[PDB]
Design a binder for this molecule. Structure first.
Ligand SMILES: [Zn+2]
Lengths: 192, 65, 76, 151, 117, 142, 144
RNA sequence: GUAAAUGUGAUCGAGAGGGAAUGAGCACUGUAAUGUGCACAGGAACGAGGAAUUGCUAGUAAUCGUUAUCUCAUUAAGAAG
């Protein structure tokens, strides 16, 4: 219908010339795999690092099927994010994809708190997070910020997605996800 | 048995007959043990769940899966 | 205070001056900046998109999105 | 730790203040210094035991450090009105309702207490509600009962 | 003051109607019971009521009529009579007043004593 | 050819509805303005001309049935086609049929105009009802 | 200068129909659900016989429109609303069918229950004590 | 009584969510309504749950209907698929 060219996301977005821009993250973020629609059934979850090979916007829609009542409603999630990309592409002026990439980069906490004490009482200490866990937490926080913001507010959900992601990419205090990344890093330092 | 009952119309003078329908436990007693409870009625068996399990292998039922 | 069921003349006048230089605008903005109800943010927004003052950029199911005089899209 | 629960304010036309010994409380673990994620209802009628068979009104495990926390209510009531209501002990310009005894925790806040008033005319006002720290009632004989600056 | 009335009809007319006519007044579930015809027991009860209202004269009361016909709707032929309805234990006595029309005899007798702990 | 499939349903059902009303080929049931389409529905229709959208969609069911050479359509078939999920308080929702009375009236109206013929096991189209549809589509796609 | 020409009329805050108050800002459908005896379903029935657009707000209606609706409430059977749409069908005391509005409902239920109690109808005795009468079990649920 | 979630367009707008106790009716099953369906009302608590506590590693958990499966005249808010 719309095009007879090369594969673009939602048939709209360029799908090339994409940079991660944190060498600690490089291997764990799939922006290679050209797909027309953020849907795949590829059975990688039954593997040792197979959940790191799933494409980026896929991981991002999965995060929306939550709050219990929305389990399994993956079409609804795609409908929501499609609209958000229109809002963001407009607002930012750059491939929605680079906004999403930079949101992840900023929103993962680098140091964390954990119990270390084995042969006695369990005493809390700071510890250093792996690349993979760092990105897992980034998606979690971005999602949790969005969900709770929309609950009993008149604004449309696709609009709230655009509010948070811009701010997160720009590392502003305005993001719920960014603030909570500061909190975790401050407490980690308190227990250092 | 299909039993019959007389009934009178509103005049209390004319009479008509109606048939009692056979339903409920009263005629579905277990064919092995006369029990009224837990009778399997499927495939025109009329045998209780206790009696079924001892005879099932004689009838020809098996647990494949 | 509760929301309103009219767009009076002086609110109407200043909305025209405000809708230029705004980028993407939506049902909520008219109803959360000014005091209008959702049932009168629809009617005013639909009117401005007939007058060529704004332009519609999406209308998928009931989700409906508009643009003003300082919008500019991506380029290849 | 011991905490006295006072009822403070300016009292007019009041014979006695009676208090339900049921306190929604915020508790902090004295081991890891973490606040319990929810308020807990501390009631005098709740019967629990320490690991040494001592009666307590609350037994809670800290979710973070697994330490046991215990609270006992000691009613400071001088009498029971109608065998139901704990009459708070009058002390100068305030009323001592109870003493809370915490072990393994601190009590950070008491949120609310259900309060009943006995007027100088022998009228009971059950479950009084404060508006901005004020309560006032008038009887059919124009006697006023009031509490101002409630704390 | 006006005469007693049921669904538009005066007690004078109502006491003269056939059961077939009275059926056009009653609620739906009671109508269905009269359409499906009376039992042999119910017929004896009704014939005794018709006999009794006819036989009784002067100021002396007629004797009580007992029945286990619990589901029978009350009819204008047993007005003023004393009737005993079986409670599963005993014949509980009652007088059939005008205001009872449109209800079954089971509606005026309790098979289970009220509970007070 | 199977000419009906060349145009989109949400353009065809509204298109025929006007041709019906301007010739009054079907006449509303008594109290159409307050009756519901099923016991499963919550409120009566939002469009006063719902009766005509039913008439327009009934002829569509018949055109596609004719196109695929199915067996003739029955009053039961149509009732299950228009069915829905009824709300039952504190219980799961349950599938329920459309009401037959509307459908019966439409089919008897169409019979009198010679648009629908009754067979022994269902209802079927007639030449005039096919040609109206044909001549509409030939403008509508262009 | 251009003009909007699609604005509602100058609106009143609240109005009186039935010894009941109706919020003028509210759209006519959910607004007539303030009067006792006008549920959702019957509210739509009246408005389409009085012939008022459903989308106007209650404070925009003229005196004329309020008389049109007032007339249809006092006598629905005149404007072809059938009896199976109405509150009180085959009245035991009158034979007729009628539609009870406002405080008439409670008054009629009371005089009815009171009559049953005067003659010992078991159904009326239970409702007076707060008990149930539609066969529901009373052991597990419905306490206090 | 031959899916429902679901797909498109309208509509409604923050107790137009919710359907508990109850009225005069209109039908069905039945030997008998006390059981079930329907229409018009009526419109209770509940605004996400204390101490505790139960399963679940992939077409799994949770959601959505459906049973020419079992009970069954009429009755599923139960099991077994
Ligand atoms: Zn047996």
């Amino acid at each position: 219908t719309e095009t007879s060219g090369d594969i673009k996301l939602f048939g709209r977005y360029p799908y090339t010339d994409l940079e991660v821009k944190d060498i600690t993250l490089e291997k764990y973020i799939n922006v290679a795999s050209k797909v027309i629609l953020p849907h795949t059934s590829s059975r990688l979850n039954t593997k040792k690092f197979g959940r790191t090979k799933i494409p980026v916007v896929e991981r991002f829609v999965n995060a929306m099927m939550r709050k219990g009542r929305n389990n399994g409603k993956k079409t609804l999630a795609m409908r929501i994010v499609k609209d958000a990309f229109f809002i963001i592409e407009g607002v930012t002026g750059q491939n929605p994809i680079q906004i999403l990439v930079d949101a992840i980069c900023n929103s993962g906490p680098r140091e964390d708190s954990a119990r270390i004490g084995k042969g006695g009482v369990m005493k809390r200490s700071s510890v250093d997070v792996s690349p993979l866990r760092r990105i897992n937490i980034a998606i979690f926080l971005l999602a949790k910020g969005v969900r709770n913001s929309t609950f009993k507010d008149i604004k449309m959900l696709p609009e709230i997605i655009a509010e948070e992601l811009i701010n997160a990419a720009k590392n502003t205090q305005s993001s719920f996800a960014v603030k909570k990344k500061e909190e975790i890093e401050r407490i980690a330092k308190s227990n250092r | 048995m299909n039993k019959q009952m007389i009934k009178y119309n509103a005049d209390l003078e004319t009479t008509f007959t109606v048939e009692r329908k056979d339903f409920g436990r009263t005629n579905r007693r277990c064919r092995a043990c006369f029990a009224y409870n837990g009778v399997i009625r499927k495939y025109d068996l009329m045998i209780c769940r206790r009696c079924f399990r001892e005879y099932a292998g004689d009838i020809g039922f098996k647990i494949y899966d | 205070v509760k929301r309103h069921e009219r767009v009076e003349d002086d609110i109407f006048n200043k909305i025209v001056k405000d809708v230029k230089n705004m980028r993407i605008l939506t049902r909520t903005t008219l109803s959360e900046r000014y005091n209008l109800s959702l049932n009168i943010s629809i009617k005013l927004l639909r009117f401005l998109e007939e007058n060529q003052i704004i332009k519609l950029i999406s209308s998928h199911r009931g989700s409906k999105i508009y643009a003003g005089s300082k919008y500019e899209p991506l380029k290849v | 730790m011991k905490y006295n629960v006072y009822i403070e304010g300016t009292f007019s036309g009041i014979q006695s203040i009676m208090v339900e010994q049921v306190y929604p409380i915020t508790i902090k673990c004295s081991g890891c210094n973490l606040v319990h994620k929810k308020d807990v209802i501390l009631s005098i009628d709740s019967i629990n035991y320490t690991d040494k068979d001592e009666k307590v009104n609350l037994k809670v495990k800290c979710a973070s450090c697994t330490r046991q926390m215990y609270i006992l209510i000691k009613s400071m009531a001088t009498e029971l009105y109608e065998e139901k209501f704990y009459c708070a002990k009058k002390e100068d310009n305030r009323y001592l309702a109870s003493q809370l005894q915490g072990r393994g925790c601190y009590i950070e806040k008491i949120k609310d207490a259900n309060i009943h008033v006995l007027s100088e005319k022998g009228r009971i006002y059950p479950d009084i509600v404060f508006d901005e720290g004020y309560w006032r009632e008038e009887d059919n004989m124009n006697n006023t009962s009031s509490i101002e600056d409630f704390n | 003051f006006k005469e007693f009335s049921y669904k538009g009809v005066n007690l004078e007319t109502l006491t003269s109607m056939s059961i077939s006519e009275f059926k056009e007044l009653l609620p739906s579930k009671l109508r269905r019971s009269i359409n499906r015809g009376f039992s042999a027991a119910e017929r004896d009860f009704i014939k005794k009521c018709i006999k009794a209202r006819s036989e009784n004269t002067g100021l002396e009361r007629p004797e009580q009529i007992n029945t286990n016909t619990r589901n029978l709707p009350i009819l204008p032929t047993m007005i003023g009579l004393q009737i005993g309805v079986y409670s599963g234990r005993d014949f509980m006595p009652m007088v059939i007043k005008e205001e009872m029309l449109g209800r079954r005899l089971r509606d005026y007798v309790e098979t289970r004593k009220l509970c007070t702990h | 050819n199977t000419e009906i499939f060349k145009v989109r349903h949400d353009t065809f059902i509204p298109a025929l509805s006007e041709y019906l009303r301007t010739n009054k080929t079907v006449v509303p049931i008594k109290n159409f303005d307050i009756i519901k389409t099923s016991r499963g529905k919550e409120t009566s229709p939002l469009d006063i001309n719902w009766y005509y959208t039913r008439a327009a969609s009934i002829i569509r069911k018949l055109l596609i049935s004719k196109a695929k050479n199915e067996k003739p359509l029955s009053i039961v078939r149509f009732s299950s086609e228009y069915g829905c999920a009824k709300d039952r308080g504190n219980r799961p929702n349950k599938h329920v049929r459309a009401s037959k009375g509307i459908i019966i009236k439409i089919l008897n109206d169409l019979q009198e105009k010679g648009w629908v013929e009754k067979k022994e096991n269902g209802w079927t189209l007639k030449k005039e009802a096919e040609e109206v549809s044909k001549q509409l589509i030939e403008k509508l796609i262009n | 200068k251009l003009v909007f020409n699609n604005n509602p009329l100058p609106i009143q805050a609240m109005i009186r129909m039935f010894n009941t108050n109706i919020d003028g800002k509210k759209q006519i459908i959910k607004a007539l659900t303030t009067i006792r005896g006008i549920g959702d379903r019957l509210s739509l029935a009246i408005l389409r016989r009085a012939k008022i657009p459903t989308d106007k707000r209650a404070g925009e209606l003229t005196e004329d429109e309020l008389n049109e609706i007032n007339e249809v409430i006092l006598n629905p059977q005149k404007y072809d609303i059938p009896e199976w749409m109405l509150n009180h069908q085959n009245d035991p005391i009158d034979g007729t069918t009628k539609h009870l509005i406002g405080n008439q409902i409670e008054g009629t239920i009371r005089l009815w229950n009171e009559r049953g109690k005067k003659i010992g109808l078991v159904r009326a005795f239970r409702t007076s004590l707060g008990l149930k009468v539609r066969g529901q079990r009373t052991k597990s649920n419905g306490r206090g």
